[PDB]
Design a protein around this nucleic acid. Structure first.
Lengths: 677, 486, 740, 24
RNA sequence: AGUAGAAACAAGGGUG
RNA sequence: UCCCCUGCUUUUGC
């Protein structure tokens, strides 16, 4: 009723009648912004200058009949003069305060619902729990993180469509929502927003803020999650870390990913430890995932992964069923086998013993990118049906299947130089070594496997040695069908024993898992994984590793010096020096260690020949077993980003440079603290 | 068509071969004997140009249990005036060379008369308007703007010419600015700032922050630079509010500051008076003139060049009680005309942020040291004063101060940057940053090299003209160069 | 003891105490009078750096033009504008080779964008020149005036609303033999029709309004800037879109990246150049700067670059993309406001417009100004100076960045064909370079090669302010890298304070700024708390909203005291209402209203968050919870803050000086528009959220919607028959009045 | 915490010329 | 006078 | 001379 009366009065005038009837709806966007008011050039100065005026604010003409002209103190609240370029009136700040104490009260129940994001923030903050503050060097990496604890995986267009459907249903247009998520969200917002007096534009803006995924480049040092980035100002600092877990029932998937990453890191770090099991337990009892101790998560988290399974076995919990190999889980549907050690000659003319499984067995293999079925006999695979996603996934699946087959054709197919002993004479599983070298290149392997035509049963496609889907010919006993998932999930938890070197053997004695199986994918934690330990900052860069180890040597120089003077052996085997050793070249590792020790020995036998800086620089090298040699090392190399940086035994070096005048040590351009005479 | 059928055929290499060999970027090695001291300008000594006295200021104080901005400024000024007995008939000691000193004398007399008039009224208004006398008309630049006419109506005037747009006259560096900085870097016996409240600490990091903040607030509240900050903020706020509110009459604005003495007793101090002129400010750079009269105990005859723009009167004698006994000293009044713009006033009301600057540089300094020790060192930083940084110069050699002294020095530097803002300072800082970086690279023996060092030196020097603050900064840079390469 | 803060650098490295060298607590230098002198000096410099070119007389505008392209090769290190077409084409070709398909994909994206861009996209400008009034106006106003004039001149090609249609209309108008304009004179409001011949309108459409830049930090002398008219903005928009599409795919380009990602790119480049190279390979870094960036860039060279980029593309696309350089080549610059003359003896002052400088006696001016006027007189046409060379306005920031990136890419070992090579980052006129070579001689050779190539393409390295050092530290656009990017807090000091939007927006922006500087600029916890305290104090003083407990006397003190005594939960009051400050480090990210939503009285909560209050007004969505903040360095940015729409979200008053000019009439017109637009909101609720589209007039859609809504409402049974009949009768009345 | 300075001299700065005591 | 610095303010317009 | 109007609006780009 009011709208049509206003339109009548508007058409009463002539200039307005001309404006309405000669401007297209498209051109509105131009005339609606038509204004003589220039964009503010100094808003701060303008605000300071205007706040001293009597009427610096603008208000709707309705105010004229909503609040009194003058205060009880005869203080004028609003003025009759109209604001330039509009019908709004000019009012004093007092009016606002008047409204805040004498204005008409209205119910406010939709506000928590409409402004859901802000109240989610406050509710999350109030339920959070704080922990100790750790004063330590913080390494922040600039990365693109998503700042939106709540978003429904919608882009601008989809978010706009949903917002239009909920707020402005009659103006939605031709669009029709199809996917279930949009329908559910629209129904929820419609029921929740029913009978809301807030301006529709504010509701639409808040819905857009809530349903759109935003991102930003920030320097982050801890967990990169929506709820953790939101509180980055409070958790991460230049030289301190504040433990904090938001009160928001951290997602199961997020904790699973964080635990997987932490497990990979801890197993990788423990593999180099002198006593891998002891270090594993100690650092599992001193690590937290998202403000929760790792051991508690292990005893309460039902997750499947090689590293987390190794950690569970070390703790003494239940282990997952099936058998993990080459990154795929094999479940024995039927059959039986017995392990036999057989001596065979490899294609590179190497004699080696391999454990073969006798009899005929049937397995279903599940992988993150492929699912398949393998029926095999002793050293002879009967058939394999693969359902890999992409060509590379199918390649890995077929290679792993035929590698598990234990065929001698595979063994003789080896070519080139292959080493089954690690670079530090650590015996490697022949099976895994074959897997790795065949993943490196399988053209020769395929060319030496054989050929077999297929009968075209049920539309199963063949595979060629050059990895193409042949229909009339296929590799011997291989079919491709591309099913969805395996027969059924395996959840028959079993108990196993863990060897001193983190080797997991079955009750009978069959090896189930080994350190060599851990994936090397170096991801980034979703939740803030706190590796609270003496020196466990390996996730940082190698330069960070070197700087932190030298800083630690400087910090604890008193006890370090007394230990070195009295019992150097206990100092050498410290858990703290191992990360430094991870960068020293393996082949020369011992060649350095013993060499360094020899110098120390001489420096112990000659009083007065105590060069503090020399000990500071050479201590991290002597953590490895001493291999005696007469070579005189002028400098020792460390691998940083694959580049060999030299540290000179005598004299200054760029990696390690100590200035006497400032009495300060700088390493790779980073201050390591101040030294004392 | 030519572009579409274009293929790269050794064009760049051929053109480079054709080009003369004189078009090259020869790298000049920057050694320890390469840099030279900056050439400071020569001329008459520079004169004080701040909007109020800094080290020569004197204040009349009264114990008042009121917080900042609570009492009526005029009543506080009247009470502070009452607290002093020993007035005298004003007489001119050091006159303003280019001004009409009798007008300044009459201005002071009129201020006293108006104070008495309001005193015998028994009702103190928030603002007091001063009569538009001839002396105030002259001192506030009344009707000094030339009439505005169309060009055609005055194109024949013989002397009609373009405005004066010559380079500012140069001035040499005077030793009073270093004394000003030294005084501004000192510790005071009374607190000068009372910060507001914040939410209760709930997190351990918040507790550490609160402890460090208590330490920093203790260190900063007892700095003279904080007094300058508060005085400038109050003066600029009052000036801007009066200019916007009453822009047609001469308003009397007392200069007041609230402090807390080491015994915990609150005090209100009056430094002087300010009379603003007509303030029909339109452009951000439009100037409003005012007359400032400030009390002091400094005899202008010791450093006349510092007080070129000032007229100094003898307004009384004060019996100061010292430790040994009482001594009588003359009480001078410095009266001058100054001007300020909207932008300058606005940037004068935000002097408090200066604190942040110094504090930030201090905090990062502590944390960098705490990161390598795994413990908060703030208490160890400035409760034992174990760590000192080179922050001064003495005849024996470089002088080192505690982190508290460094914080106070940085606060004073920021305050003086705020109080002596000018394009010269901006240009000098921007240009000398490059020379500082080159010197730092030389100190890190990173084989620094320059393509045209003399050009950089010329660019740096062209910004030193007549500002005492930038000249002092250049002298400091020369000292640093002397000490940074030996 | 003589305190000397500079001596602090003897212990603390300069990069770690760089904030001490930024005097940003004081007011920045400002321009007081006219910018005519700066503009004239800039024109003289632009024509001096390329004086050895070809002089021609434009046949359309009849103004002299200087063409230094393919001019003589430089013989000295002074700035040059002689860019070689073949060299630039070779650089573009090699860039295409290094990143195959970059130009093709960028062009495809630009073609997609061009056909979908609306004319209203040009309303998002800032103070564009307006030829109809011959003065600076807001973008929307200038566009509306241009559209109105074109419609009045029988040019209705933009009715479709597409930007390309508007460009076609602009071309047709430039083809017109005569133009008609409306001018307002007051002597009383009077309207006059002014006829402009072809040359006059052509000069106006190529005219650029010049002013002086103020609030610039780090410069002793002021400089001039230029703003173009509405005619060329449309073409420049598409050119910028294409350049941005190209730059997004270039790793060495520092744009449109901004802030942390730029530092990440710089760190990545530094590590790639340092760690990968062996210890035998020497590496150095140049933190150089380019001098006279906008004076030595020629629109002809950008035309050549655009022509090469758009190869094998539809003709219309090439034309629309290449027209902007053509317009920039034949550009005229307005000479500011003029000058002021003063007579001491007669005590008089007067304003001489710049338009009269062509034939004014030179006895008035001083030596320097007289020299400038004498040197610029030949170029003055219709009161504007012809300026063919240079890019004074610098609207082609991204094309210049592309050229610099191509020059950088020319440093690959395969292109240098020698031991030395180089790589780095280029953002607009700034660049960080890194040269790797076996020895110092190789480093010098690489630096010389880069410098000579840059000179050849038209880029001059300012030897005066550049330096080279071992690639361990450097600087780039105030980002200081010392084995890692050390944060400097001074740059953001001006941002700390009361922004001046309103109480709620100012509080939100202050807390957000504190939090963001904590995250990015390494602001310590204690310093953050003290900044919070100082901001609260400044906010209270600025808005006169001190706590009700205190007795500070202000005009607003009485109401605040009455409210404070009225409420019971005094902790829930907003700081705008004299409440306490509950903010701390932990809750810096929570808006104030939600931070204490549970501590507020029911009546106070209802009053404050009342949507019916008159103080709150909502414009288009893009302006919601979004403010414009100009940093110390760089252009104005858009900052998004978290806040709840309350009574503290008011809008300040507008300037009224326009009431005392001849342009007062537009103000009235403005009001009318708002009225109509407001009535549309009551009719189309979604109009402000999403821009409506339609060829129909306002009244037609209004009446259609009215009839349909009336019928639906009556069918629902929510309205009695009498109201439906009355609204239908009024709708018939409206329809009939629409015809007359 | 009470700030102190080694340069603070208890005798040289007599009667505090900036903020002296003059009450009779 | 003063502010200030390459050009300005030291009020600008209008009416009777 | 009173009175009325005005305090970023002939000048702030990208």
């Amino acid at each position: 009723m009011e709208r049509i009366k206003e339109l009548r009065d508007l058409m009463s005038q002539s200039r307005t009648r001309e404006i309405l009837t000669k401007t297209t709806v498209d051109h509105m966007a131009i005339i609606k912004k038509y204004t003589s008011g220039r964009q503010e050039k100094n808003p701060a100065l303008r605000m300071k200058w205007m706040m001293a005026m009597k009427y610096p604010i603008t208000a709707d003409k309705r105010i004229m009949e909503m609040i009194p002209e003058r205060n009880e103190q005869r203080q004028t609240l609003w003025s009759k003069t109209n604001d330039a370029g509009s019908d709004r009136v000019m009012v004093s700040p007092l009016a606002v305060t008047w409204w805040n104490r004498n204005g008409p009260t209205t119910s406010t129940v939709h506000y928590p619902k409409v402004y859901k994001t802000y109240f989610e923030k406050v509710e999350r903050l109030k339920h959070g729990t704080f922990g100790p503050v750790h004063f330590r060097n913080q390494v922040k990496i600039r990365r693109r993180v998503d700042i939106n604890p709540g978003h429904a995986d919608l882009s601008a267009k989809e978010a706009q469509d949903v917002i239009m459907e909920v707020v402005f249903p009659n103006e939605v247009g031709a669009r029709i929502l199809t996917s279930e998520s949009q329908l559910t969200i629209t129904k929820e917002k419609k029921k929740e927003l029913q009978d809301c007096k807030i301006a529709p534009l504010m509701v639409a803006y808040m819905l857009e803020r809530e349903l759109v995924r935003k991102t930003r480049f920030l320097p982050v040092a801890g967990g990169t999650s929506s709820v953790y980035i939101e509180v980055l100002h409070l958790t991460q600092g230049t030289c301190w870390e504040q433990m904090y877990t938001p009160g928001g029932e951290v997602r199961n998937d997020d904790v699973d990913q964080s635990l997987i990453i932490a497990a990979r890191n801890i197993v990788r770090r423990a593999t180099v430890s002198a006593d891998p099991l002891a270090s594993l337990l100690e650092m599992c009892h001193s690590t937290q995932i998202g403000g929760v101790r790792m051991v508690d998560i292990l005893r309460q988290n039902p997750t499947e992964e090689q590293a987390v399974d190794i950690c569970k076995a070390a703790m003494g919990l239940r282990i997952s069923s099936s058998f993990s190999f080459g990154g795929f889980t094999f479940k024995r549907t039927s059959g039986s086998s017995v392990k036999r050690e057989e001596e065979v000659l490899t294609g590179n003319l190497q004699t080696l013993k391999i454990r073969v499984h006798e009899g005929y067995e049937e397995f279903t293999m599940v992988g993150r990118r492929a699912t398949a079925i393998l029926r095999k006999a002793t050293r002879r695979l009967i058939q394999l049906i693969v359902s890999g996603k992409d060509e590379q996934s199918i390649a890995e699946a077929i290679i792993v299947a035929m590698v598990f087959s234990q065929e001698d054709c595979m063994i003789k197919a080896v070519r080139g130089d292959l080493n089954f002993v690690n670079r530090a004479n650590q015996r490697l599983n022949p099976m895994h070594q074959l897997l790795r070298h065949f993943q490196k290149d399988a053209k020769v392997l395929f060319q030496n496997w054989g050929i077999e035509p297929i009968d075209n049963v049920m539309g199963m496609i063949g595979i060629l040695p050059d990895m193409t889907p042949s229909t009339e010919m296929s590799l011997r006993g291989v079919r491709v069908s591309k099913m969805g998932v395996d027969e059924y999930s395996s959840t028959e938890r079993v108990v196993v024993s863990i060897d001193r070197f983190l080797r997991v053997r079955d009750q009978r004695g069959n090896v189930l898992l080994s350190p060599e199986e851990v994936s090397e994918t170096q991801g980034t934690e979703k939740l803030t994984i706190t590796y609270s330990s003496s020196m466990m900052w390996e996730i940082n860069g190698p330069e960070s590793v070197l700087v932190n180890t030298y800083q630690w040597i400087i910090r604890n120089w008193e006890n370090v010096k007394i230990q070195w003077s009295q019992d150097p052996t206990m100092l050498y085997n410290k858990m703290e020096f191992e990360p430094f050793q991870s960068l020293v070249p393996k082949a020369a590792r011992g060649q350095y260690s013993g060499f360094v020790r020899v110098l120390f020995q001489q420096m112990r036998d000659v009083l007065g020949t105590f060069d503090t800086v020399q000990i500071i620089k050479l201590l991290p090298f002597a953590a490895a077993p001493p291999e005696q040699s007469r070579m005189q090392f002028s400098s020792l190399t460390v691998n940083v980003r694959g580049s060999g940086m030299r540290i000179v035994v005598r004299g200054n070096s760029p990696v390690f440079n100590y200035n006497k005048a400032t009495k300060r040590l700088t390493v790779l351009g980073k201050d390591a603290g101040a030294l004392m005479e | 068509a030519y572009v579409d059928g274009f293929e790269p055929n050794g064009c760049i290499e051929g053109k480079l071969s054709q080009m003369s060999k004189e078009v090259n970027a020869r790298i000049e090695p920057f050694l320890r004997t390469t840099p030279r001291p900056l050439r400071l300008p020569d001329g008459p000594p520079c004169s004080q140009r701040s909007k109020f006295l800094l080290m020569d200021a004197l204040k009349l104080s009264i114990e008042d249990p009121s917080h900042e901005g609570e009492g009526i400024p005029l009543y506080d000024a009247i009470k502070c005036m009452k607290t002093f007995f020993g007035w005298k008939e004003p007489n001119i000691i050091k006159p303003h060379e280019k001004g009409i000193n009798p007008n300044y004398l009459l201005t002071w007399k009129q201020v006293l008369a108006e104070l008495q008039d309001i005193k015998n009224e028994e009702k103190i208004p928030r603002t007091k308007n001063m009569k538009k006398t001839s002396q105030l008309k002259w001192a506030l630049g009344e009707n000094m703007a030339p009439e505005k006419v169309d060009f055609e109506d005055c194109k024949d005037v013989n002397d009609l010419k373009q405005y004066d747009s010559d380079e500012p006259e140069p001035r040499s560096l005077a030793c009073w600015i270093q004394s000003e900085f030294n005084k501004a870097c000192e510790l005071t016996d009374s607190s000068w700032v009372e910060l507001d409240e914040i939410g209760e600490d709930v997190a351990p990091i918040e507790h550490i922050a609160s402890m460090r903040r208590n330490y920093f607030t203790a260190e900063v509240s007892h700095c003279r630079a904080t007094e300058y900050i508060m005085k400038g903020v109050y003066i600029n706020t009052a000036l801007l509010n009066a200019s916007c509110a009453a822009m047609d009459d001469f308003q009397l604005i007392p200069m007041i500051s609230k402090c807390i003495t080491k015994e915990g007793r609150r005090k209100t101090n009056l430094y002087g008076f300010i009379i603003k002129g007509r303030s029909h400010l339109r452009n951000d750079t439009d100037v409003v003139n005012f007359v400032s009269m400030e009390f002091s105990l400094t005899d202008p005859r010791l450093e006349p060049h510092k007080w070129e723009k000032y007229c100094v009167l003898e307004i009384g004698d004060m019996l100061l009680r010292t430790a040994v006994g009482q001594v009588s000293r003359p009480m001078f009044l410095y009266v001058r005309t100054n001007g300020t713009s909207k932008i300058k006033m606005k940037w004068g009301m935000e002097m408090r942020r200066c604190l942040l600057q110094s504090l930030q540089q201090i905090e990062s300094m502590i944390e960098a040291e705490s990161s390598v020790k795994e413990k908060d060192l703030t208490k160890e930083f400035f409760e034992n004063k174990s760590e000192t940084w080179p922050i001064g110069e003495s005849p024996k050699g470089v002088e080192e101060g505690s982190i508290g002294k460094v914080c106070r020095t940085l606060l004073a530097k920021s305050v003086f940057n705020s109080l002596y803002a000018s394009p010269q300072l901006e240009g000098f800082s921007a240009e000398s940053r490059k020379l500082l970086l080159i010197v730092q690279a030389l100190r890190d023996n990173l084989e620094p090299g320059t393509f045209d060092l003399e050009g950089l030196y010329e660019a740096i020097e062209e910004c030193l003209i007549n500002d005492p603050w930038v000249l002092l900064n250049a002298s400091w840079f020369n000292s640093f160069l002397t000490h940074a390469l030996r | 003891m003589d305190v000397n803060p500079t001596l602090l650098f003897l212990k603390v490295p300069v990069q770690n105490a760089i904030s001490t060298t930024f005097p940003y607590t004081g007011d920045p230098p400002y321009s007081h009078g006219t910018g005519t002198g700066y503009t004239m000096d800039t024109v003289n410099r632009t024509h001096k750096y390329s004086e050895k070119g070809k002089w021609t007389t434009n046949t359309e505008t009849g103004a002299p033009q200087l063409n230094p392209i393919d001019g003589p090769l430089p013989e000295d290190n002074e700035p040059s504008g002689y860019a070689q077409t073949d060299c630039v084409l070779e650089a573009m070709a090699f860039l295409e080779e290094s990143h195959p398909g970059i130009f093709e994909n960028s062009c495809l994206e630009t073609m997609e964008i061009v056909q979908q861009t609306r004319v209203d996209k040009l309303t998002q400008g800032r103070q564009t020149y307006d030829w109809t009034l011959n003065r600076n106006q807001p973008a929307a106003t200038a566009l509306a005036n241009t559209i109105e004039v074109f419609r009045s001149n029988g040019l209705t090609a933009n009715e479709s609303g597409r930007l390309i249609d508007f460009l076609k209309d602009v071309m047709d108008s430039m083809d017109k033999e005569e133009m008609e304009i409306t001018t307002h004179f007051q002597r009383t409001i009077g309207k006059k029709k002014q006829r402009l011949n072809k040359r006059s309108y052509l000069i106006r459409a190529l005219t650029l309004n010049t002013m002086t830049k103020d609030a610039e930090r780090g410069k002793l002398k002021r400089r001039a800037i230029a703003t173009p008219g509405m005619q060329i903005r449309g073409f420049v928009y598409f050119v910028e879109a294409l350049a941005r599409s190209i730059c997004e795919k270039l790793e060495q380009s520092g744009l449109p990246v901004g802030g942390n990602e730029k530092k990440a790119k710089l760190a990545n480049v530094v590590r790639k150049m340092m760690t990968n190279s062996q210890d035998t390979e020497l590496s150095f870094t140049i933190t150089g700067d380019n001098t006279k960036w906008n004076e030595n860039q020629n629109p002809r060279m950008f035309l050549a670059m655009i022509t090469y980029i758009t190869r094998n593309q539809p003709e219309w696309f090439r034309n629309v993309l290449s027209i902007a350089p053509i317009m920039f080549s034949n550009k005229m610059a307005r000479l500011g406001k003029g000058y002021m003359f003063e007579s001491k003896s007669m005590k008089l002052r007067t304003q001489v417009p710049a338009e009269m400088l062509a034939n004014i006696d030179l006895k008035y001016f001083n030596k320097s100004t007289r020299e400038k006027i004498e040197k610029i007189r030949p170029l003055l046409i219709d009161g504007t100076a012809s300026l063919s060379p240079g890019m004074m306005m610098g609207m082609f920031n991204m094309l210049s960045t592309v050229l610099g990136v191509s020059i950088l890419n020319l440093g690959q070992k395969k292109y240098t064909k020698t031991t030395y090579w180089w790589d780095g980052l280029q953002s607009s006129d700034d660049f960080a370079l890194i040269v790797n070579a076996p020895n110092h001689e190789g480093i010098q050779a690489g630096v010389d090669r880069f410098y000579r190539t840059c000179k050849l393409v038209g880029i001059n390295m300012s030897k005066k302010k550049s330096y080279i050092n071992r690639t361990g530290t450097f600087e780039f656009t105030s980002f200081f890298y010392r084995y890692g990017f050390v944060a400097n807090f001074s740059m953001e000091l001006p941002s700390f304070g009361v922004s001046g939007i309103n109480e709620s927006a100012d509080m939100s922006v202050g807390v957000t700024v504190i939090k963001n500087n904590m995250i990015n600029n390494d602001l310590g916890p204690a310093t953050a708390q003290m900044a919070l305290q100082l901001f609260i104090k400044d906010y209270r003083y600025t808005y006169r909203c001190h706590r009700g407990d205190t007795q500070i006397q202000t005009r607003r003190a009485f109401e605040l005291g009455k409210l404070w005594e009225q409420t019971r939960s005094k902790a829930g009051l907003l700081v705008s209402d004299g409440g306490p400050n509950l903010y701390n480090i932990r809750n810096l990210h929570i808006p104030e209203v939600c931070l204490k939503w549970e501590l507020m009285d029911e009546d106070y909560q209802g009053r404050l968050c009342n949507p019916m209050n008159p103080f709150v007004s909502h414009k288009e969505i893009d302006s919601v919870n979004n403010a414009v903040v100009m940093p110390a360095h760089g252009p104005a940015k858009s900052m998004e803050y978290d806040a709840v729409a309350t009574t503290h979200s008011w809008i300040p008053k507008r300037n009224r000086s326009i009431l005392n000019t001849s342009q007062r009439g537009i103000l009235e017109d403005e009001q009318m528009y708002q009225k109509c637009c407001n009535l549309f909101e009551k009719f189309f609720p979604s109009s402000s959220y999403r821009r409506p589209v339609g060829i129909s007039s306002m009244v037609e859609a209004m009446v259609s919607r009215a009839r349909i809504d009336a019928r639906i409402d009556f069918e629902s049974g929510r309205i009695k028959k009498e109201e439906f009949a009355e609204i239908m009768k009024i709708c018939s009345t409206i329809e009939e009045l629409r015809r007359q | 915490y009470s700030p102190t300075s080694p340069s603070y001299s208890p005798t040289s700065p007599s009667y505090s010329p900036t903020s002296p005591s003059y009450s009779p």
